[PDB]
Design a protein around this ligand. Structure first.
Ligand code: HEM
Ligand SMILES: *[C@@H]1O[C@H](CO)[C@@H](O)[C@H](O)[C@H]1NC(C)=O
Ligand SMILES: *[C@@H]1O[C@H](CO)[C@@H](O)[C@H](O)[C@H]1NC(C)=O
Ligand SMILES: *[C@@H]1O[C@H](CO)[C@@H](O)[C@H](O)[C@H]1NC(C)=O
Ligand SMILES: *[C@@H]1O[C@H](CO)[C@@H](O)[C@H](O)[C@H]1NC(C)=O
Ligand SMILES: CCCCCCCCCCCC(=O)O
Ligand SMILES: [Cl-]
Ligand SMILES: [Mg+2]
Length: 325
């Protein structure tokens, strides 16, 4: 189905309402590394089992949180291309599931958002690095570090100053302890934007002050649960203020090279100076690696989802076509 268009009405409104109550997980219900999608599934903005179409995810992030249309399109189709089933049009917001339908041939994993190295990656704020054995569950120690950073840099609240310090701390902990730490291309970009999302989207829209309290923070990050009477943001947004996060501790894209404390800059990586390159490498290297010589139906589905992806790409970039036209 087509990418949904922006909200007709983007006002702050109650999204924790009678039609979208929080429910606990049933057996089979999938939650993953994204507290946003997790919250939308747990309020029934997405199917509660955590398996959804791209169109469902786009409508959910807009309606539930006032995520802006362009960000919603780019992030949803990028995740779907690398983690979703392109024939069934279904994506797991967590673990690999037979509910996404019959798999394509390898090396495509259709591993859901839990799949490491595709969308999900290292130096997450409240989830551990995949090397430490779990890239998706809420982590109490990490969240207590977010609370500590909120006390030290945010006067008890999560804000872009806290994002700046914590983003860097998580990178330096991954450099120190994960010999397989990877911080290049797609992850380098998403890792910065994600640290703004709590300040931009988890703050009650009647305040919209970019100061997230630790009760609300815990309710989203741990329980996938809106605060009682939660109002979504009063206007569409996603990553606004990411510039403050980068400016706090500017980092070059790089990786550990099989050892802790071996962070090596990758000159082949995109950075914030080459945003078009990040899109080109994502489509030409990542997507094409998972589907090197696709069958005619898969090729059609790929081309359709790549067109959709390109709608989410900022103007100034040229569309790349790994399967032709
Ligand atoms: C647009 C569709 C979305 C997709 C496909 C998506 C996907 C993801 C994925 C796969 C991650 C895990 C990356 C990682 O940390 O390793 C992530 C992280 C995150 N997402 Fe989403 N997301 C979406 C929208 C949103 C929205 C609307 C919000 C907030 C309302 C949000 C908030 C977050 C936050 C805070 C994290 C970081 C969690 C952490 O580091 O502990 N995302 N997202
Ligand atoms: C838009 O939504 C707001 C909040 O729910 C509501 O009060 C208002 O009547 C709506 N206005 C339009 C233009 O539909
Ligand atoms: C959570 O994170 C900490 C440190 O980052 C780690 O030591 C721990 O093994 C993780 N998992 C649990 C179950 O706390
Ligand atoms: C975060 O909170 C601290 C303490 O209240 C404040 O000094 C800082 O200006 C805030 N930053 C932002 C971006 O709101
Ligand atoms: C991707 O492939 C296209 C040709 O299909 C090429 O124009 C483009 O420069 C490549 N982008 C990079 C280097 O990833
Ligand atoms: C999922 C993380 C991405 C969220 C926001 C990314 C920031 C927008 C892209 C670059 C911004 C800029 O260079 O002006
Ligand atoms: Cl929008
Ligand atoms: Mg991660």
């Amino acid at each position: 189905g087509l990418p949904p268009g922006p909200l007709e009405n983007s006002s702050a409104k109650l999204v924790n309402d009678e039609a979208h109550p929080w429910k606990p997980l049933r057996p089979g219900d999938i939650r993953g590394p994204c507290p946003g999608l997790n919250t939308l599934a747990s309020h029934g903005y997405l199917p509660r089992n955590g398996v959804a179409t791209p169109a469902q995810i786009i409508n959910a992030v807009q309606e539930g949180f006032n995520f802006d249309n362009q960000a919603a399109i780019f992030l949803t189709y990028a995740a779907h291309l690398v983690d979703g089933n392109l024939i069934t049009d279904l994506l797991s917001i967590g673990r690999k599931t037979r509910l996404t339908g019959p798999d394509p041939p390898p090396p495509a994993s259709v591993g859901g958002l839990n799949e490491h190295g595709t969308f999900e990656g290292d130096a997450s704020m409240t989830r551990g690095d995949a090397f430490f054995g779990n890239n998706h569950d809420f982590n109490e120690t990490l969240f207590e570090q977010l609370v500590d950073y909120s006390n030290r840099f945010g006067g008890g609240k999560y804000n872009l100053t806290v994002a700046g310090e914590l983003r860097f701390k998580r990178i330096q902990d991954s450099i120190a302890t994960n010999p397989n730490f990877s911080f290049v291309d797609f992850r380098f970009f998403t890792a910065y934007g994600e640290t703004t999302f709590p300040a931009n989207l988890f703050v009650d829209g009647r305040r919209d002050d970019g100061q997230l309290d630790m009760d609300a923070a815990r309710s989203f990050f741990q329980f996938s649960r809106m605060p009682d009477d939660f109002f979504r943001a009063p206007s569409p947004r996603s990553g606004t203020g990411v510039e403050v996060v980068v400016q706090a501790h500017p980092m070059q894209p790089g990786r550990n090279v099989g050892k802790i404390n071996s962070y090596t800059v990758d000159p082949t990586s995109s950075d914030f100076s080459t945003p078009c390159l990040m899109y080109e490498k994502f489509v030409n290297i990542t997507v094409k690696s998972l589907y090197p010589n696709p069958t005619v139906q898969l090729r059609k589905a790929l081309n359709t989802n790549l067109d959709f992806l390109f709608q989410g790409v900022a103007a100034g970039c040229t569309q790349v076509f790994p399967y032709g036209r």
